[PDB]
Amino acid sequence: AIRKKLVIVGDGACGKTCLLIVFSKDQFPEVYVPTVFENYVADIEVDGKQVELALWDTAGQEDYDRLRPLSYPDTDVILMCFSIDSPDSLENIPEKWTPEVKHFCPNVPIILVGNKKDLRNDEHTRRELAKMKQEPVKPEEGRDMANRIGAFGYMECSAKTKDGVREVFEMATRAALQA
Amino acid sequence: SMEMDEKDFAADSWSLAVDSSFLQQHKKEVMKQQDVIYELIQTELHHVRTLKIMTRLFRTGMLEELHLEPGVVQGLFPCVDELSDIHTRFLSQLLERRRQALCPGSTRNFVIHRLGDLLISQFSGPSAEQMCKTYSEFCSRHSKALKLYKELYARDKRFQQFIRKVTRPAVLKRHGVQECILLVTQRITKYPLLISRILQHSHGIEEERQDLTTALGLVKELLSNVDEGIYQLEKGARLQEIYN
Ligand SMILES: *CC(=O)Nc1cc(C)no1
């Protein structure tokens, strides 16, 4: 019954809030998707170990540099999120979020998560990105970034289709359990 | 929370809270607006409840069952009485605005048309000044409250006994001492997100779109002032550490 804390970080529209909601409810909300996430305590059993995983969000704190670090105390695993339909949100991963998470959370495993992977095949996503001389984040660009920032690993998921969501959180539990 | 309010805000949305034949009578844009307003009140009800767990369950229980200085309990629960009054008054104003909007013969069917006014009173003038001062005070004592809980939980067996005892119910799963403290620090940064999504579907009446635009600017001004006012306190800090 060990207790572990998980905090998800990332830019405004990286889908961190949708991801925590979809995992804690265990389905894509059919009628209404909530604007905000309060907190949750998930009961996870990974590789034979039972863990109470407390989930937290940093949405709303991105502009407040003194309030935001109050979410970090005693974090056991960091989910560093970016959105596959926003290659610019990936550029901020090593320049803004990594040095802050390493400063406040030394030696805490970080999993780089590419969210919204369904948008890699969406036509409106490609057409709009190509207007700004861009295209969806490629699987190798995510893996290289995780490698460069010294991440524990790289994962992709789609909160809209629920694909990869369960595996991200069970892996995060494993990462939190390593001494 | 009180049973009446918990049932009124038990559904996942305004669409599911109201009767289906009442929902059918409204435009999609209104349903979308109502869903975000219902989420703002539902989360405010949960916020006030979190503060009652801190004041009535944790704070008062420690005073009545343990032998700790009143200074220890004050360091574990800074500003909780002031925060509880600020938000219980806000919640009363939001719940009354909903009640006034109820159809006669119904306790569940309503539509809130005016909201920007209530949000402007909460986040402007004297009331906003006290809330801003209260949040800079709370957030500057947040780390010290956490270290003090951990110091007492690892050195005091009777404090540990008390904690295991009052946090045993399943309803308290995500509401332990440190969780309540972060839930309260995170509350203020939620308001702009909810207000921005309410404004996104309030373009039908220009007086209302303007009221919500003013309210969005007021919460962001408040937040920036609370963020500027934070200077973290340390448990047992020396004077030399502070003036450097
Ligand atoms: C947040 C805040 O309003 N702080 C404050 C204002 C004045 C005047 N003194 O402290």
DSSP state of B171: G
| Cα of B130 from ligand 1 centre, angstroms | 8
**Integer Cα distance of B176 and B168 in angstroms:** 10
**Integer Cα distance of A170 and A168 in angstroms:** 6
Binary contact (A64, B223; C-beta < 8 A): yes
Q: Which atom of ligand 1 is nearest to the CA of B132?
A: 1
**For residue B126, what are its two tokens?**
């004297």
- Ligand 1: residues with CB < 6 A are B 129, 132-133, 136, 225-226, 229
**For residue B213, what are its two tokens?**
């635009």
Tell me whether strands A49-57 and A40-46 are parallel, antiparallel or unpaired. Answer: antiparallel
User: In this structure, how many other beta carbons lie within 10 angstroms of the beta carbon of residue A1?
Assistant: 7
Residue from the list B35, B188, B223 with its beta carbon closest to the beta carbon of A32 = B35
| A17 close to A36: Cβ distance less than 8 angstroms | yes
**For residue B173, what are its two tokens?**
């799963």
**Integer Cα distance of B211 and A148 in angstroms:** 47
| B103 Ramachandran zone, left/alpha/beta (phi>0; psi -120 to 50) | beta
Binary contact (A38, B46; C-beta < 8 A): yes
| Cα of B132 from ligand 1 centre, angstroms | 6
Packing angle between helix A165-177 and helix A16-25, nearest 10 degrees? Answer: 90
Helix (H) or strand (E) holding B2: none
User: In this structure, how many other beta carbons lie within 10 angstroms of the beta carbon of residue B145?
Assistant: 22
CATH number (domain holding residue A29):
3.40.50.300
| Cα of B129 from ligand 1 centre, angstroms | 6
Residue from the list B43, B143, B182 with its beta carbon closest to the beta carbon of A56 = B182
User: What is chain B's length?
Assistant: 244
**For residue B137, what are its two tokens?**
């005070």
Domain that holds residue B217: 1-244
End-to-end CA distance of chain B: 45
**Integer Cα distance of A12 and A89 in angstroms:** 9
Q: Which residues of A7-35 are buried (b: 16+ CB within 10 A; e: fewer)?
A: bbbbbeebbbbbbbbbbbeeeeeeebbbb
Which residue of A lies nearest to B14 if distances are taken between CA atoms?
A32
**Integer Cα distance of B87 and B95 in angstroms:** 12
Q: How would you write chain A as a 3-class SS string? A: CEEEEEEEECCCCCCHHHHHHHHHHCCCCCCCCCCCCCCEEEEEEECCEEEEEEEEECCCCCCCCCCHHHHCCCCCEEEEEEECCCHHHHHHHHHHHHHHHHHHCCCCCEEEEEECHHHHCCHHHHHHHHHCCCCCCCHHHHHHHHHHCCCCEEEECCCCCCCCHHHHHHHHHHHHHCC
Helix (H) or strand (E) holding B54: none
Q: Which residues of A88-108 are buried (b: 16+ CB within 10 A; e: fewer)?
A: ebbeebeeebbeebeebbeeb
Q: How many domains does chain A have?
A: 1
Q: How many domains does chain B have?
A: 1
Q: Name the residue with the closest Cα to ligand 1, atom 9.
A: B133
Domain that holds residue A13: 3-177
**Integer Cα distance of A54 and B173 in angstroms:** 10
| Cα of B86 from ligand 1 centre, angstroms | 16
| B49 close to B6: Cβ distance less than 8 angstroms | no
SS3 (DSSP) at B13 = coil
Tell me which residue has tokens 């949000």. Answer: B119
Helix (H) or strand (E) holding B181: helix B177-187
SS3 (DSSP) at B230 = coil
Resolution in A: 2.2
**Integer Cα distance of B54 and B78 in angstroms:** 10
Contacts of B173 in chain A (CB under 8 A): 41
End-to-end CA distance of chain A: 16
* Residue B19, strand partner residues: none
**Integer Cα distance of B52 and B57 in angstroms:** 7
Which residue of B lies nearest to A40 if distances are taken between CA atoms?
B174
Binary contact (B230, A59; C-beta < 8 A): no
Mutate to test the pocket of ligand 1, among B225, B227, B228 (most ligand atoms within 8 A of CB): B225
| A40 close to A55: Cβ distance less than 8 angstroms | yes
Q: Which residues of A touch B (CB under 8 A)?
A: 29, 31-32, 34-36, 38-41, 54, 56-57, 59-61, 63-67, 70-71, 73-74
Which of A176, A19, A150 is CA-nearest to residue A82?
Answer: A19
**For residue B17, what are its two tokens?**
């809270």
DSSP state of B190: G
Consult the annotation and say whether A167 binds a ligand.
Answer: no
**For residue A22, what are its two tokens?**
């979809």
Distance of CA B90 to the CA centre of its chain: 9
Q: CB distance from B130 to chain A under 8 Å?
A: no
| B201 close to B29: Cβ distance less than 8 angstroms | yes
**Integer Cα distance of B115 and B118 in angstroms:** 5
**For residue B240, what are its two tokens?**
């030399």
- Residues 6 or more apart whose CB falls under 8 angstroms from that of A46 comprise A170, A173, A174, A177
**Integer Cα distance of B209 and A145 in angstroms:** 42
Consult the annotation and say whether A59 binds a ligand.
Answer: yes
**For residue A79, what are its two tokens?**
């989910």
One-letter amino acid at A62 equals: E
- Residues 6 or more apart whose CB falls under 8 angstroms from that of B31 comprise B14, B15, B23
